[PDB]
Design a protein around this ligand. Structure first.
Ligand SMILES: [Mg+2]
Ligand SMILES: [Mg+2]
Lengths: 683, 8
């Protein structure tokens, strides 16, 4: 059991048992969050847990539509998407419900990385260390997080595929066996299919592979053939030309023994790169980039963590990677994927992922590395002891990622309540009907309602967010006007191809600027030169409260000149203490009988205090204070939650029509009403 | 954190 030599074993059977254990383990772990989120009712729909990233419903939707047979005209469905396609294959191949497939797919597929980890390890005659590099790599924070049992987004193979490509590269370097020639341009293709954006990453890995062929291999044949086939796999050529051209250029090389000279290969290279060439190789709005969670920044603490779940382990891993490299050279071929992770630090939070698997092999090597110092600096160490030491070093370094997984308990994109509200919305609304909501929501809104939306997590530039921002944060009447004009003109963009929709409306209402247009959606009696084609809704859920500032900013940003119109003072927080001095999270207090706030030392007069007791019914008590102030304090007793507004947010169609349940009845109709969310419709 | 959502 424990006295056997595991280090020096690199056998088929062994490698596959370690792949089995590694994989099974990486799956068991994704699978605690299910052990936890099932005892919670708010997390279920159609008798199964729901998805964990907005992004997901993009594909879900799409796939569902693929399962139907068709998606509608000009609604933005991901019918045919990589992920959609694969879900809809595995669906018609399996006895499990869409929701459960959609659910566990992430868990399955992303556990595959555990395979190239230990395989590459094994190329380096270090399998057992690979096993470790992969237990670690299949759990590390960033990776787990973007790959939970819930995460039905493109991310499940984003690191499996290039990591396969790289073991491909290396196996070519070492064994120079021809099967590699078929695999890397195949992998490189699949990756490119199943994530259009891996483009640059692939380009880069190929560049490297070439400069590297030039250094360490400027003589070997197979290699230029490979650069050329990879390069062909990169370009944009009907799948058939690729598969074909590859297979011919393969057989000729396997069965033509040796007879091909450099010049004709450099012509294959030049030619192929020509294929590449033939293929490809004023109105200002607020910026959606200082706004996306997934792309927020980091304190290098969490950088390290995210990449390896332990700063000490990060410092061990970096070193292990350095030695591994300047001990093997091929591992050098990982550099791009390292760099991407590091790009995180200035590019985004969501990039650390790229640097997990590599920095794991690194770590693995360091153990080998280290266990050398011992055996090689003369240190009699028996096998019982070496194995116990390995197992402990390992459990020790992995446990942090375990802990993180325990502590990492997401809810769902939405709760049952919200879903079912939307589903209910399906049977009331027509498939061509537009729903105005914020972009965070658009996907779910769509998967659950089959409706069309103005903006989604994909269509969410400042220019696109402007409308949904406006309808939701400006005054009721003008909001009610945007809704109409934004939906209609968004449906017109689909034929007349407006580069700037807002500008379209403007030039189509003979207004000289954009503030003259917008200060003009006020007057309830509004000319309508553009026709009514479908019914428009507006979804206003409690959840969007924490975001009201961020959402409002966009319409606050005057399309004419970048500038932010108003001041925007807003904040939602909870109570912690009372004597009558009440402390609020954000450091704001409520003092002298709900009249004034201590906002960083500054006492402030409340223009009033609103006390809302029934969101559903409209029952509140408007307390008047300092008629000559600007800051409103609200209390939602149904959510024991405090709010802090300024006049214009107090008057924004959302706070007005949701929190206070008051809405101009000749403009709207309250289609749905719940403490959790409302839905209105234009008349 | 890791989700294509708005904050904050
Ligand atoms: Mg995503
Ligand atoms: Mg549809």
């Amino acid at each position: 059991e424990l006295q056997q030599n595991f280090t020096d074993n690199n056998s088929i059977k062994y490698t596959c048992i370690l792949i089995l254990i590694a994989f099974a383990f990486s799956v068991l772990c994704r699978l605690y969050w299910v052990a936890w989120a099932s005892e919670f009712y708010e997390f279920f729909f159609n008798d199964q847990l729901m998805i964990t990233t907005n992004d997901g419903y993009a594909f879900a939707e799409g796939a569902r539509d693929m399962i139907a047979g068709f998606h509608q005209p000009n609604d933005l469905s991901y019918f045919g998407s990589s992920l959609s396609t694969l879900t809809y294959w595995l669906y018609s191949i399996l006895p499990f419900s869409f929701e459960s497939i959609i659910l566990y797919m992430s868990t399955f597929f992303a556990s595959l990385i555990v395979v190239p980890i230990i395989l590459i390890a094994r190329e380096y005659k270090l399998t057992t260390y690979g096993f470790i590099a992969a237990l670690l790599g299949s759990i590390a924070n960033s990776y787990y997080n973007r790959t939970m049992s819930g995460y039905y987004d493109t991310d499940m193979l984003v690191l499996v595929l290039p990591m396969l490509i790289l073991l491909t590269f290396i196996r070519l370097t070492i064994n120079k066996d021809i099967f590699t020639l078929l695999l890397s341009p195949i992998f490189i293709m699949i990756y490119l299919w199943w994530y259009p954006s891996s483009y640059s990453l692939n380009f880069a890995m190929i560049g490297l592979f070439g400069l590297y062929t030039l250094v360490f291999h400027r003589k070997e044949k197979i290699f230029y053939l490979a650069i050329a086939l990879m390069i062909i796999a990169l370009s944009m050529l009907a799948w058939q030309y690729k598969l074909a051209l590859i297979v011919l250029l393969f057989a000729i090389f396997a069965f033509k023994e040796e007879k091909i000279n450099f010049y004709m290969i450099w012509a294959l290279i030049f030619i192929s790169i020509s294929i590449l060439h033939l293929s490809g190789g004023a109105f200002m709005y607020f910026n959606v980039n200082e706004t996306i969670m997934e792309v927020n920044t980091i304190d290098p603490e969490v950088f390290m963590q995210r990449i390896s779940s332990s700063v000490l382990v990060f410092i061990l891993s970096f070193i292990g990677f350095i030695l591994l490299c300047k001990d093997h050279k091929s591992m050098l071929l990982a550099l791009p994927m390292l760099a991407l992770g590091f790009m995180a630090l200035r590019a985004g939070l969501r990039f650390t992922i790229y640097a997990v698997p590599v920095m794991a092999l690194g770590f693995g090597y360091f153990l080998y590395a280290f266990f050398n110092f011992l055996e090689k600096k003369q240190i009699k160490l028996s096998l019982r002891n070496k194995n116990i030491l390995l197992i402990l070093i390992a459990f020790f370094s992995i446990s942090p990622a375990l802990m993180h997984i325990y502590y990492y308990k997401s809810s769902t994109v939405f709760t049952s309540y919200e879903a079912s509200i939307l589903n209910d919305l399906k049977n009331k609304a027509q498939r061509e009907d537009y729903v105005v909501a914020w972009w965070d929501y658009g996907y779910p809104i769509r998967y659950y309602s089959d409706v069309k939306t103005l903006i989604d997590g994909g269509k969410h530039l400042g220019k696109d967010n402007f409308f949904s921002s406006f309808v939701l944060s400006k005054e009721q009447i003008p909001a009610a006007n945007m809704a109409r004009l934004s939906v209609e003109y968004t449906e017109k963009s689909f034929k007349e191809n407006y580069p700037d929709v807002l500008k379209a409306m403007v030039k189509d209402y003979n207004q000289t600027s954009a503030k003259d247009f917008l200060e003009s959606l006020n007057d309830k009696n509004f000319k309508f030169d553009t026709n009514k084609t479908r019914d428009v809704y507006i979804y206003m859920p409690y959840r969007m409260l924490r975001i009201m500032p961020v959402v409002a900013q966009f319409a606050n940003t005057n399309p004419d000149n970048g500038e932010q119109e108003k001041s925007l003072f807003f904040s939602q927080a909870n109570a912690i203490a009372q004597d009558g001095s009440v402390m609020l999270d954000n450091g704001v207090e409520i003092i002298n009988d709900f009249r004034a706030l201590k906002v960083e030392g500054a006492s402030i007069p409340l223009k009033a205090f609103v006390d809302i007791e029934s969101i559903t019914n409209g029952k509140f008590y408007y307390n008047e204070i300092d008629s000559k102030a600007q800051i409103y304090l609200l209390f939602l007793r149904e959510y024991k939650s405090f709010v802090i507004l300024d006049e214009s947010l107090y008057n924004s169609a959302y706070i007005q029509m949701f929190l206070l349940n008051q809405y101009d009845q000749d403009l709207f109709e309250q289609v749905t009403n719940d403490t959790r969310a409302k839905i209105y419709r234009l008349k | 954190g890791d989700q294509n959502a708005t904050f904050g």
